[PDB]
Amino acid sequence: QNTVHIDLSALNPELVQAVQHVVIGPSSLIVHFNEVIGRGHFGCVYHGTLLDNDGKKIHCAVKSLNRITDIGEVSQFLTEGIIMKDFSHPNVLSLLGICLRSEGSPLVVLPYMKHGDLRNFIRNETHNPTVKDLIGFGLQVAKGMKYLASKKFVHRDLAARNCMLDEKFTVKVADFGLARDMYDKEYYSVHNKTGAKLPVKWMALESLQTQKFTTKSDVWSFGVLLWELMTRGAPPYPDVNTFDITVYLLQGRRLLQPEYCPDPLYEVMLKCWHPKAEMRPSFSELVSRISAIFSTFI
């Protein structure tokens, strides 16, 4: 549609062609602004009712971006997150499209997750996840990161709070690309010189020192995610406040083994926490080490 040139006239030409491939007509989307499912730094996430080509009314989550005041920053956000339109994996949150509107902000359309984020699903005292069920979640997250890493994409915010569960209990890595924001305002430290939002208790040791993220720092973060699942959503490093983490990790200290974490899986965690990033296993090694531990549960 030609609405891109008008409603997003601050976009680089090549990005105009990119976002044009994923535009949703306003007649296809019903945004339930009175049914807010959550908030965030960049804006709110509402309920949605998308209508596909055949006519299926699909439940979706619509992310508002009205809090980004600078209209040039909106173009940068779409510039950094448009690549996600090329991602199609069962364990990675797909992108349904973008609804554009001048005198307003572009609406990002994501599919709805019935059981919310993975952390609040396993912390909830009403659900009963067996040890095997929790390792199944970790295996799916490793499958999603194996795909993302294969696309040379760095997540730099991988945590149980950023993974989701659909109706069939399929885990989907999220909080990346156009769906990236800050939804838990207690775990992130804002850099006063660069503005980057850092999950310090999830970043690799080398990431805390130089502020860079590779495909090995998400392996470290994936280690926290496996620790969270075993502890059913306990806060990592509870006795170490955010200024001693870096010194805590330089001595070689790591997270203790959870009371119900099988020894082979903890071994996978320490591998993710190698001080040398090049010694950590790839997400393809993780998808074979964890799947083997998950298959012993027959």
Ligand X SMILES: CCN1Cc2c(ccc(F)c2C#N)O[C@@H](C)CNC(=O)c2c(N)nn3ccc1nc23
| Cα-based angle 129, 228, 276 (whole degrees, multiple of 5) | 140
Q: How far is the CB of 161 from ligand X (least distance, A)?
A: 6
Instruction: Confirm or deny that 44 is annotated as ligand binding.
Output: yes
Find the binder of ligand X among 105, 162, 217, 221 (CB under 6 A): 162
3-class secondary structure for 133-185?
HHHHHHHHHHHHHHHHHHCCCCCCCCCHHHEEECCCCCEEECCCHHHCCCCCC
Encoded one letter per residue, x for contact with ligand X by CB under 6 A and - for no contact, window 174-213 reads xx---x---x------------------------------
3-class secondary structure for 183-221?
CCCCCEEECCCCCCEEEHHHCCHHHHHHCCCCCCHHHHH
Q: Between residues 35 and 70, which has the closer beta carbon with respect to ligand X?
A: 35
Q: Does 158 bind ligand X (CB under 6 A)?
A: no
Of the candidate spans 70-78, 172-180, 238-246, 285-293, the one that interacts with ligand X by CB under 6 A turns out to be 172-180
157 is catalytic: yes
DSSP 48: E
Encoded one letter per residue, x for contact with ligand X by CB under 6 A and - for no contact, window 43-82 reads --x---------------x-x-------------------
- Strands 171-173, 163-165: pairing is antiparallel
Asked if residue 109 lies in contact with residue 22, where contact means CB atoms within 8 angstroms, the answer is no
- Strands 163-165, 29-38: pairing is unpaired
CA distance 288 to 293: 9
Asked if residue 56 lies in contact with residue 74, where contact means CB atoms within 8 angstroms, the answer is no
CA distance 143 to 284: 8
Encoded one letter per residue, x for contact with ligand X by CB under 6 A and - for no contact, window 81-110 reads ------------x----------------x
Catalytic residue selected from 7, 52, 86, 157: 157
Q: Which two tokens stand for residue 126?
A: 């009403």
Find the binder of ligand X among 26, 90, 116, 233 (CB under 6 A): 116
Find the binder of ligand X among 1, 5, 33, 38 (CB under 6 A): 38
Instruction: Confirm or deny that 39 is annotated as ligand binding.
Output: yes
Find the binder of ligand X among 31, 100, 113, 122 (CB under 6 A): 113
Instruction: Confirm or deny that 219 is annotated as ligand binding.
Output: no
Asked if residue 270 lies in contact with residue 256, where contact means CB atoms within 8 angstroms, the answer is no
Of the candidate spans 3-11, 113-121, 245-253, 290-298, the one that interacts with ligand X by CB under 6 A turns out to be 113-121
Q: Which two tokens stand for residue 77?
A: 């956000």
Q: Between residues 45 and 135, which has the closer beta carbon with respect to ligand X?
A: 45
Q: Which two tokens stand for residue 53?
A: 């080509």
Q: How far is the CB of 88 from ligand X (least distance, A)?
A: 16
CA distance 119 to 121: 5
Task: Write the single-letter amino acid at 166.
Answer: D
Q: Between residues 117 and 228, which has the closer beta carbon with respect to ligand X?
A: 117
* Residues of the shown chain interacting with ligand X in the complex, contacts defined by CB under 6 A: 37-40, 45, 61, 63, 93, 110, 112-113, 116-117, 162, 164, 174-175, 179, 183
Active site residues: 157
Annotated binding site for ATP: 37-45, 63
